Every structure is written in C-alpha cells, then in structure tokens.
C-alpha cells in the first residue's frame, strides 16, 4: 500500500470522531470541530459523514483555529498533499495552509489560501510538501468569517497518491 | 454553445460501479477499446476521488494496434478551449498516447496535436492541449497504442475543458 506516515485523516466515521495524529494549536483562540453530517448541503458521502468545520459567526469574527500535523517525512521525497474544502457563502471566512518550521525559531510559511466564496460544492486543493532537510509540520488555519450561514469545511487530508511534483500544486480559484 | 463541456465532454469516467465514458464513443473501425476501471489496488488509481479511470493494457500480442475514444463535437467557431487531462505511462514499453482532432465530414481528417511515447514516470501527469478556434468542427480523439510491455498500460482520467486557463498558460512547462 503506502508507508504509515501517520499524516492522513478522514476524521473518523459515525461512531468515532477523531483528529488522527493532528493536534490543536495552543497559540490561538478556537479549534476546528469534527462534525458527523448526514444532512444539509455539506456532507462526506464517500467517508461516512465526518469532516472538520469552522462555523462563520459574526461574534467570533477573525479569530483562528489551527490544526497542526505530525512532522512531515520530507528528507528523501516530496509529497503531494491533497485535501477537500467547502467554502460557500460570501462571508464564509478564510482558509490558509502553512508550513511551520522550527529553526531559526518557530515560524509559519503561507503556501495556500482561499478567501471568501469558492463555490457551492466540495473542491480539491493540493499543496506540494517539498523535500527539505529542515523539518516542518503542516497547519490548516481557519479564520472565522462574519457570515451567519455555513462556514469552512475541510476533509480527507492525504499524501496517499502518485502525483508528479510539477503538477501537484492546485491553488484556490481565489 | 457555451455550456457544451458539461453535456458529455468533461469526463471523470464515473464513480464505483457507475462506469461511464460520458458522451465519448469508441471508434468501431479499430480493433481495441479503452476500458473503465474502478480504483481498488495497485499504484494506478484515481486516489484523490476514489474514482474511475480509463486504461489500455500493454500486451505484446496486440503491439501497435490502437484503442480510440472519440469525443462529442467541440464547438470551436467562436473560441479556443484549454483541454486538461491526466495520464499515467509507466514502463519503457507501456505504449504510445496520442491526442488527435478529427475534423468533421466532408473531407474528414485527423490532426495529431499531442503524443507521448513510452515511459513518462511512475506517477500521474497532467496534459494540456489548446483546442483552437475553427470554422470546421472537430472531435477530440484519445488514442492508445498498445505497447509490447508485459506489465501495466496507459491510463487516462479527468478530461476537461477549463476556460480559466489562457491560451499561453494552456501548455506544459508552465
Ligand atoms: Ca471524512
Ligand atoms: Ca469524501
Ligand atoms: Ca476519475
Ligand atoms: Ca484524480
């Protein structure tokens, strides 16, 4: 199959919500919720209904949640990170992917970003996890929008693919 | 006129036991056909969607024969379109992949516009072909020439017209 890197996450199934080996960042005010949704317009039909969610809420506007991956095995190969996201609504918020390094000190490098409405359906995002001797973790950062309908969903984060490096990158269409 | 791609041209080849060529058709004058496979195991899969794809197996006994899949008519009188697709060609003798434009009757002819021969890499790659503006209408052909390889084959997936790529960006090394 593929090596057990501990990196992938579907966020479980109906009788089991999980963040796998990912962790909530303790430098920010909110965290991502794991939902099981078998109703309404945002669902995980392929994976028995579980995803993470950052609800738009004018009262929480501009606070962030950050989910932080295990350290990426980045030394021999690059990886293509794929994930799915759902950002419907004009004030749904902002989703950023960052690479967190340790060594000058701990700092974040912005590599992917989607601001506001992206469409009324799930979309595929991809980010190349470049080869690097300097070690890093991946961060999914949800910034709460002012809308009062919906929010940012993310699901099915994976490096289990054989996608060429040059074609990996799939930015947000805004 | 302007929504034709989603009427059978754009094709992911279905999902699970829904195996489909959308509105693409087998050329019947030719000996072999492409097959739709469901992603189960092995290194060739539509991993990111858990989806289907098309495949032309290498087989030394059919070396040099072709399977030909023929698109619906492209409406090209008013504009060019960027067609993107994915392909997987691993093995020195995996065969040859050709994209042709078959211009409409009378005075039908086939114009070759994209060809890959032999080993391209152990991973999915993205092809791009600019479907030029033309008064004479045409169909796109995906043509798989059987390699003499004993393992593997040419896989293709996720053919689409993407009108947000400009003509200069409708190209590899990009
Ligand atoms: Ca899921
Ligand atoms: Ca899913
Ligand atoms: Ca597919
Ligand atoms: Ca795919």
Question: Cα–Cα distance between B20 and B37 in angstroms, integer?
Answer: 10
Nearest to B47 among A46, A160, A164 (CB): A160
- Resolution of this structure in Å: 2.2
How many angstroms separate the CA of residue B15 from the nearest CA in chain A?
Answer: 10
Residue of A nearest to B50 (CA): A46
Residues of B in contact with A163 (CB under 8 A): 48, 123-124
Separation CA A89–CA A83 (nearest Å): 20
Sign of the dihedral defined by the CA atoms of residues B55, B157, B8, B174, in that order:
negative
Q: Which residue has the tokens 């798989």?
A: B144
Three-state secondary structure of chain B: CCCHHHHCCCECCEECCEECCCCCEECCCCCECCEEEECCCCCCCECCCCEEEEEEECCHHHCCCEEEEEEEEECCCCCCEEEEEEEEECCCCCEEEEEEEEECCCCCCEEEEEEEECCCCCCEEEEEEEECCCCCCEEEEEEEEECCCCCCEEEEEEEEECCCCCCCCCCCCC
CA distances (Å), B63 to each of B22, B37, B87, B142, in order?
28, 21, 20, 17
Q: Is the dihedral of CA B131, B128, B82, B146 positive or negative?
A: positive
How was it solved?
X-ray
Residue A85: name the closest of A146, A28, A142, A46 by CA: A142
Distance, CA of A54 to CA of A152 (rounded, Å): 5
- Give chain B positions within 8 Å (CB) of A170: none
**Angle at the Cα of B156 from the Cα atoms of B152 and B162, rounded to 5 degrees:** 160
Alpha carbon separation from A93 to A69, A116, A144, B32, B131 (Å, rounded): 22, 5, 5, 51, 37
Dihedral pair phi/psi, residue B83, rounded to 5°: -95, 120
Task: Please count the CA atoms within 13 angstroms of the CA of A23 that sit on its side-chain side.
Answer: 6
What residues does B25 pair with on adjacent strands?
Answer: B70
Residue B59's nearest CA partner among B154, B128, B127, B124 is B154
Q: In order of start, what are the domains of chain A with their CATH numbers? A: 1-174 (2.60.120.200)
Residues in chain A within 8 Å Cβ distance of B90:
none
> Are residues B128 and B82 in contact, defined by beta-carbon separation less than 8 angstroms?
yes
B108 inside 8 A of chain A by CB: no
Cβ proximity of A53 and A33 under 8 Å: yes
Please answer whether residues A79 and B48 qualify as being in contact, where contact means their C-beta atoms are separated by less than 8 angstroms.
Answer: no
Q: Chain B interface, mutation test: which of A44, A84, A119, A163, most B Cβ atoms within 10 Å?
A: A163
The whole-angstrom distance between residue B174's C-alpha and the CA centroid of its chain comes to 20
Closest Cα to residue A125, out of A87, A69, A76? A87
Residues A154 and A87 sit within 8 Å (Cβ to Cβ): no
Give the HSE-up count for residue B65: Cα atoms under 13 Å, Cβ half-sphere. Answer: 16
Chain B 1-40, residues with CB within 8 Å of chain A CB atoms = none
Query: Residue A23 belongs to what H/E stretch?
Result: strand A23-24
Query: What stretch of H or E contains A100?
Result: strand A93-101
């Amino acid at each position: 199959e593929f090596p057990d890197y501990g990196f992938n996450c579907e966020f479980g199934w109906g009788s089991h919500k999980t963040f796998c080996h990912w962790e909530h960042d303790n430098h920010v005010q909110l965290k991502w919720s794991v939902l099981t949704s078998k109703t309404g317009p945002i669902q995980d039909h392929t994976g028995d209904g579980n995803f993470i969610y950052s609800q738009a809420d004018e009262n929480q506007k501009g606070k962030v949640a950050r989910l932080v991956s295990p350290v990426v095995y980045s030394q021999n190969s690059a990886h293509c990170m794929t994930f799915w996201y759902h950002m419907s609504g004009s004030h749904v918020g902002t989703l950023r992917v960052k690479l967190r390094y340790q060594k000058p000190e701990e700092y974040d490098q912005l590599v992917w970003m989607a601001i506001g409405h992206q469409g009324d359906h799930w979309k595929e995002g991809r980010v190349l996890l470049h080869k690097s001797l300097k070690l890093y973790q991946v961060i999914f950062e949800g910034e709460i929008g002012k809308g009062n309908l919906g929010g940012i969903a993310v699901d099915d984060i994976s490096i289990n693919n054989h996608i060429s490096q040059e074609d990996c990158a799939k930015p947000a269409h805004h």
